[PDB]
With several copies, the nearest count.
Chain A
């Protein structure tokens, strides 16, 4: 009522580990939050543009799938 601060240092470290990273600078965490916020702003902006065009009040998985696709980040698994 954190939010971007809610994406924790430990979750970021985990993401980095899956990315093969062994050692992390203390400044990486805030940097990562900034980058993640930009990514979401970009994808959500387009998804909401599709939502509004449809005259809907609910963002659907398809709105997100279409937004991701036009940003060159096609996601499989959510087209039901």
Chain B
């Protein structure tokens, strides 16, 4: 096994596994060679985007280890990730701090 397909694609995500999963997923009769490479790259990119943001969140909370809360903070404070995961629940994620203005002390202000 000279070079893995992931290495040839310059990827960290497993191209061969993605190829195999596409094939066993019954998505189509055939799967072209570039499909698992393109897809692995997208999966890796999205993972990097969320990890970057969750890592920033961990850092803002004085922590070095990303926990579910940080992933939730990262996704919910990001307009696009929030939309992509609009119908997803991150377990142990909690919610963003948010109090409707009218509820704050002194009538409404």
- Please say whether the chains A and B touch (CB closer than 8 A): yes
A-side interface residues toward B, CB under 8 Å? 18-20, 22, 68, 72-78
Identify which of B91, B95, B98, B100 contacts A75 (C-beta below 8 A): B91
Question: At the interface, is chain B mostly helix, strand, loop or mixed?
Answer: loop
Given A20-B100, A76-B88, 15 other A-B residues pairs in contact with their CB atoms under 8 A: A18-B95, A19-B95, A20-B98, A20-B99, A20-B103, A68-B89, A72-B87, A73-B89, A74-B88, A74-B89, A75-B91, A76-B89, A76-B90, A77-B68, A77-B91
Show 20 residue pairs from A and B whose CB-CB distance is below 8 angstroms, ordered by the A residue.
A18-B94, A18-B95, A19-B95, A20-B99, A20-B100, A20-B103, A22-B103, A68-B89, A73-B87, A74-B88, A75-B88, A75-B89, A75-B91, A76-B88, A76-B89, A76-B90, A76-B91, A77-B68, A77-B90, A77-B92
Residues of A within 8 A of B95 (CB): 18-19
B-side interface residues toward A, CB under 8 Å? 68, 87-92, 94-95, 98-100, 103
CB closest chain-A residue, reference B72 = A76
Residues of B within 8 A of A73 (CB): 87, 89
Pairs of residues from A and B, 9 with the lowest C-beta to C-beta distance, nearest first: A77-B91, A22-B103, A74-B88, A75-B89, A76-B90, A72-B87, A20-B99, A74-B87, A18-B95
Q: How far is the CA of A22 from the CA of B89 in the complex (A)?
A: 24
B49 to nearest A CB, angstroms? Answer: 16
Q: How far is the CA of A77 from the CA of B88 in the complex (A)?
A: 11
A21 to nearest B CB, angstroms? Answer: 9
